[model samples]
Target: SDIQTYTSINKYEVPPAYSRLPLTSTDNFDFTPFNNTEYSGLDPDVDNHYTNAIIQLYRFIPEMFNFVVGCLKDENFETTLLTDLGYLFDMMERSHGKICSSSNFQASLKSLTDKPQEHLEEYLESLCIESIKRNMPQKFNRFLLSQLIKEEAQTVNHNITLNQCFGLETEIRTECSCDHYDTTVKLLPSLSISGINKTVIKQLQNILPYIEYAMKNVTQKNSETITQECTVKNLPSVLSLELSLLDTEFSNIRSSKNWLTSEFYGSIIKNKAVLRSTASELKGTSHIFKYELNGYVAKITDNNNETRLVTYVKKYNPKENCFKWLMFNDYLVVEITEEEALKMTYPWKTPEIIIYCDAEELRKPFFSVDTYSINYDILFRDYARREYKLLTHDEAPKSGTLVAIDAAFVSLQSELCEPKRTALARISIIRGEEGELYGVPFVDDYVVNTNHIEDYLTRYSGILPGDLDPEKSTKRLVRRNVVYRKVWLLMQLGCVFVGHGLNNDFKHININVPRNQIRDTAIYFLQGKRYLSLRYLAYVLLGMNIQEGNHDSIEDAHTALILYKKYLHLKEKAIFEKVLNSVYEEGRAHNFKVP
Candidate 1:
């Protein structure tokens, strides 16, 4: 009777364990110079290191990277794996060596399946297939049916189907004990191999031999299977090999990491004869195949039984005209010698996948993106209420224009996790010129978040419970992408940004504006390690008291602009230091509070 009653009950939504709140402090005083200017790393938060490694591998491939970037620049843009990857890649390039987050791309991936994690090869396959579908929808439909339905296979036989850039086509022949034989062709995104008790060099040297032997003899219940042969029908420009090494073998190799590195390198460069012979034999062609080591992904497991992935990639240095190896371990990227990169010093660190690119393909130059051509129409369009005046034809944003901006965030998830996450709830931007519209806001956007917001932080963000809910809220609401694009367009227009605590603002917004293009009030007013709050600075510098109630982004942005203007005035007269000292003294006397 109880079971029957329970079965009749309706399903209920689970409540969140906790809610998120606005950050208590946004002041960032660190002024250390950025040194790494070559490769960008991705953040590992949200357990995305596995995908990050694969993404980095694809990013270094010139042709694949350029194709995605080209699609991004096309007139028609859609939200797909290709475009998301293109956006992430573009952000990494623009980062100037800063770490980037793959939240958006990962979010897109999450939409595909309920399973949180999948194999890297599966992810790549999905992305490649989606890219093909989007590139030519009508052709893709035909191609899909041909590949699936044998009846329609001949319909599209004459049409050329796009070959996956990182896949291999091979033919497999099998024979049974009863003399029944069959031949089938298949495409493999990555070659999978085992027997890691042998050295990696030995496995690569006898790659084709191993491939043949691995599938040669198999015995099933009441049947004996013998694989006659396997031949490569086509080879991709980029080849990926997945190594299945046992945990014990990895521990044994950990005792001497140098052996693997030296052996791996030796197999590739110093000992290329075996690979050349094998490639030629497999293809049954006179053309020689020259493949260079592009990079490899290694698995790292800690004492907690947790595992993450790191990639060691070779990046081309235009100035040096050579390729240098670098390690991308989540947000930390560092240059390492070839020996250092190959050294698997830890028992838990084992090579999972190795990538090789054709010599000629690797020599192709990378595509450069045109940063100035982002559609400006995104900003001019009135997606939200016209809370601010639109830029006139003569007043359109240009390079070097001073723009003051401020952003308010709400917690997207709980702060119980490390690296608390927040989403932009509203952003306000105003002109900093000396005119009637100097402090008048031109962009005041309320971002509509689809995620279950944990908190609005009304007192700090001035965002009420219903502010972001379109159905309940009275204010104009725009999509997060719309607001982000608006700001990105302004930045690309070469306008300088002035704001208080812009470091936190831009970080939360997931953008990396150049230091030269930023004039942060929090940094300018800082005289020591201590960071002054925007309200405190205004109280002492402008003799103004603000933030007495809920914080308003528009008011905060205007205050920051005014503070920057005063700072410029004092600096121009060469009395900025004296005034700053006086302000700090007065602040110390009043305990840095406005009375």
Candidate 2:
């Protein structure tokens, strides 16, 4: 047991851990004050000649140290200044009972958002520090004993390192064999600033691929060369990620000397339903693989040359299966979100460090969308709802009203390409019952093309140079999202669509409606291998000169409706003729002749 404690120093050690004190300090121990009323024992000042006479033993031991410390706690003069200092600095020493019992602290906790990130992380560090510290060995033999029990029980002893506290694992190749370290780095949860080149400013989503980017010694190689390595000894139950903006280059960066400065702590959290609201927001990015930003503690420096702490501590709500963000500064805490956190742009809070902990089943989704429920955390509900509307029904009412829709695409590129990517420039939709129709023409959202708009194709599309602008032209202007919503609504409601080459139009707009609801003039009029043009068919069926010079979408929509009505008339007459022909085999059938 003594050997293990003495040898364990070869590895990293965190606070709240016990060390075997040397027997050398025995001479420094003071016993002259034995007159203090606690103990009443016999003290013999005999010559050295009688010292070896009988069996007499007196020495300092583990029990003596514990007994003396217990006495101090029972009777002592507590100081005011040093009381809160220990609670604030020591990550592993938090008096939860004291913090929880105080009505002021509770009120402050409820208002964590108004504070800063630096303040929030400092306070959240203690919950696990004390818990893990208790599992540490008080006596040298306690460590060995705990290890034996763990070996038998197939569990870990309470020997945690500062690096492990932040869920980090450091890889060191020594002459001796030890446990392997993990190199899988994930993106830091909050917004991070990189001072490496002074040109890097990024959100968490943009930094995902580089999550494992770290710099270490040239001893043991990372399994994946592109991966980053760190000094957290083991995967932590709760941890922190401290980012900084300094003069150091990323390629020459060094590993943390201690977990105290490493910027992370905590035991491993067990599940992924973790940060529902925050995770839902990250899912909006559509690329995050794992880890939820349950909470974070960030630090930003002010111009006064003084550093202040701000922390974001998430309190889980079991019923909602989510969490709320609390910003803490010293004893004051406020409720906050990204909106408030992003207030500082120039002297903004660089995500200095993040502390994570195992949640009590009250964490939100920090990863992808909820796979089980297919639900979005609160942060991304709007995005998911928008996507769903664009992809499916726009949550609008369904109707059986038949309508004709047409679109004119302007060439977005200089030259027409094979995989032609064209933007919808002008749109015309007409809706009606069996015979009546109302035309509503709209210029495509101008915002779709932020760059230069190429040829308007005025020869083919009725759109002139400034025809697509609502301010200049007679047509109404709408945003692209609104257009998608309108199209989604029409498709969802199963509105019967009538148009000439309507299938091509739907493809250009990127929508898929049920086949039964679409009536294409080009397909209906000509059933043979050869295809007929919409303009030719319109003139043939409706006796109208549609697209005489330039194609008009409204006139084309009306033309398609008239042609479909004529086809329906012809269909009914054909069915009646067949019925009459079969009734009288030798006689002539009722006349329904060819055109």
Candidate 3:
């Protein structure tokens, strides 16, 4: 033991070994903190890491990512796996490498099932395949349908067939004892294979042979013995292969250290090609399809018999000039070497699902947001008379336009542990661009509330006793849906929103604006861990006194807009950091007062 400790200490002299060694204590080392700024991870606190791993796998697939985002641009699209997954993907992308919650997407999943299931692989398979099959766009259908019929000799009459993007079509032939033969074609989202006594390469290389072998001479439900043979008919752009493993085998693989590293075929051929062909033979095939391993989802079982899932994805790091492997274990994302990723030697870890993508398709770029599909009419039309001003033809909102917004809410119900359930009472929006109507209010809407108000919080919300009541109130009141639709339209129009504490406001309003489209003053002039309020920021940065009385949404919105403008100017002059430091110092002296 003493000699082993001395040798371990000596091993630290090597730079590579030193870096790879896990630090048990920081007593003698000053390690730089690892900050993930490249890819975002999903929150695991919600007991949905199993789903999170699968979602990360999908997000890494460029084709699926682009396809889902493309569906979000459609005006007619509604709530489904497409929209929910798209929203989740956008949130993850905009998280700025921070952990994001999958609660919204998980909520959508709950609505579909009467009881939650244990396996996310099966859940994702059903959700993605069924949802896409039902909600696929006509243009996309035509395009994929044309490619399918053109590439392969098959008769598919259903224009709205299963999604060809991920579906694997196979032909099965069965012969009974009486010599009656039957043939059928089926489309499956993923192919399941036995994991017992099989290597990854052996199974993948002999996929067709294994299918035939596994199905040979099986007993039928009709009390007759049958022999079945199956072969791949059509290959999708993305291939998902599931491995069925027992607990003992999973534990055994985890203990084995001599797992062979064989030559991995990066591509597979279709059309009855040789199953175990060499690279040279694969190149000579008539319909050669090249694929790259996108990622794999691994199942982990702990000492307590509790299980969780994690994913390993290959992401291209332009700074490194090569693709790097990232192991995403729920909220914690860490880098791993290619050998470590392929070895799968971690304790109690077993690869459950392996994903492969078309090499050419993997290189394709993500689809850009379609700004033309946005409905600008919502900006011009008013649900309540004299409540809002409409922009002229010349001042019409467009993509990348700046708008300042603020919202006030009233508590609908009170909770002890959680934040009070609030509903939008009023919303104020002002133009941010320089024009005659700059800083002028364009939308001042009071939402009609049918629920009983628990608290108006008049001091903070600026809502009077009868403000939301349409019959008793003198304000221009509109239905909650109307105002929500208007704001949703503005967001879809690609307008950048400038505000203070807009996150809380949006949370109450139940809308998600991408981080790139938000310019919140509260976050802009932040000092260390301290968030400077809009009132304090206006006093310190702009030298203006605002929000003196009960909070007014319009005044607050205008103040936030001016503060953002000042921030931009300060940033352009390269003195924002210096100014922010001084502002914080001044605030510390005055207790962040308006004086």
Candidate 4:
């Protein structure tokens, strides 16, 4: 069996359909420039009451001004009248028609003086019409069929437009009680939620049928339409979604071919959404479109039904790929990393709106002008992308120049669930160089004292009780002293040690390697002031996952080694910088480099 699927073209009708005409001319020849510097010239009181109000009105009727400007710039004003006379009057006020001193204007102002608001609408209409009729054989039409309706103009060509992106269309099917059917439409851009409902797209789509049933009557005895169905469409680049917990229902919606109108009559604070580009969802598809996580908007409502929208923006400094998360309230900023950003509370509570622009829209120095050339520091210290081929473990030198290390510890618990921590139960090492690739040989010692054996922490350590048994154990139970000696042998090989969180591991084993002779991943991949976790570093930087469930010391050691190989430049830089700083400090103390 097959069913009919209905699609809607729009959601909210913002009341106005036809563009409001701009004023033909203003009484004052000085049409003060409309920008920041002009606004700043006005005193605060005058700016707030007069200038600000006028500016807000302009924002409200942008459609009118945009069309009129388009017409005037291209050619003389056409004879065709826009559909909405009400919008025309608004345009007149905005265009500075009040300053006109003509007798006809005086009569218009006198007529505008009765019934207060009622007379004002007609007065504005007459004043605007009279002001512009001098050049034409005047005619007025309620239906706007002017050239302005042919194609909608963008708010601003370069900036993001809100309505086009947030607009939605609803398809309605009404089944009449007399067996007659009529199809109408409604627009809905937002939805209201009461109680618990999932905000995911899956739930919203699935609830459409139920929403249709509840929106209208479905009886067959007498009404014009017994059953009503609604569906939405016409998505834009930016998507806006509102979640209203206050209004249990929606009403007061009028629809037509050119216009859709709605009013808000809810008690709870209302939330409006914004549109944007790609996010972490399109991470790997950078070959098509590249983007990054920008930030999030948080809408908080008070007891008075007042809602405040705040943004916690993410800022990235490309010079070193370092970053800080800025909270727009209180001027608070904190240098953070990918790990901290992921763990943030506000962003997690309400998912962030990631702004993704065309990666190709980036700035660049003039290619042909040699004098204009600008050389920027590399954005990422990437070593895996080097031209030289990686050397496999077989091709690597026998004596190590670089090596990674890891260790696993266990906790013994008492009958009361008290946990007592012990020394390293397993220590692992992988020897490889910057050019090394697959098949790196792992060297480790998996041993623990029998007297301290209580729990192996098998879930994390990947070691089992059976592995510690003398005859049955698969691993060799060498003494701690013997393992310590082996570790010294690797150290004496003159390898630069690479490990993630090696400070803890080394402290547990109580082995000391000179500070400049080692590279810790925790220190190497730092963003601003924070460090990322091993798994996260591997995922974002290396596009791989390690230490999934059970932890393997040798596997972790190998992971560190692989990471070091991939980011060899970062590894080298940190080591080199530390050595240089040390040399300079010692030189200063010994006065060796004094002229």
Best by TM-score: 1
Q: Residue 463 of model 4: what lDDT?
A: 70
Worst 10 residues of 4 by lDDT: 258-267
Question: What tens-digit string does per-residue lDDT give for candidate 1 at 1-595?
Answer: 3110111122121111001112223334221121245577665554233567677877887866675564444322233344566677888888867667777666545443333133322443434220111112112222222222222112222212224555456566666544677878876555555453344344422233333333332323233434455555555676666666466655565655244322111122221222334343344234555666788876654444545566778866678877787766655555667865665554545677667777677777777567324456755667724467866667778889889999998886664633545677889889887777778877787877666787788889978776655473566576665576677767767889999988888877777788888999888998785789888888777778899889989889999998888888998999989988987778788887666
Q: Which parts of model 2 are misplaced by more than 4 Å?
A: 1-399, 414-420, 435-448, 467-471, 575-595
- For TM-score, candidate 2 versus 4, the one ahead is 2
Clashes of each: 0, 60, 0, 12
- Model 4 C-alpha lDDT per residue in residues 34-73, reported as the tens digit of each score: 2111111111111011111112222222232343333321
Off by over 4 Å in 3: 1-37, 45-47, 91-99, 111-162, 172-184, 194-231, 251-274, 280-286, 302-306, 316-322, 370-386, 390-392, 397-401, 407-428, 434-496, 503-595
lDDT at position 224, candidate 3: 52
RMSD of 1: 12.6
* lDDT (CA) per prediction: 0.61, 0.36, 0.60, 0.36
TM-score ranking of the models: 1, 3, 2, 4
Error of 1 at 233 (Å): 2.4
TM-score of each: 0.72, 0.35, 0.62, 0.28
In candidate 4, position 468 carries an lDDT of 51
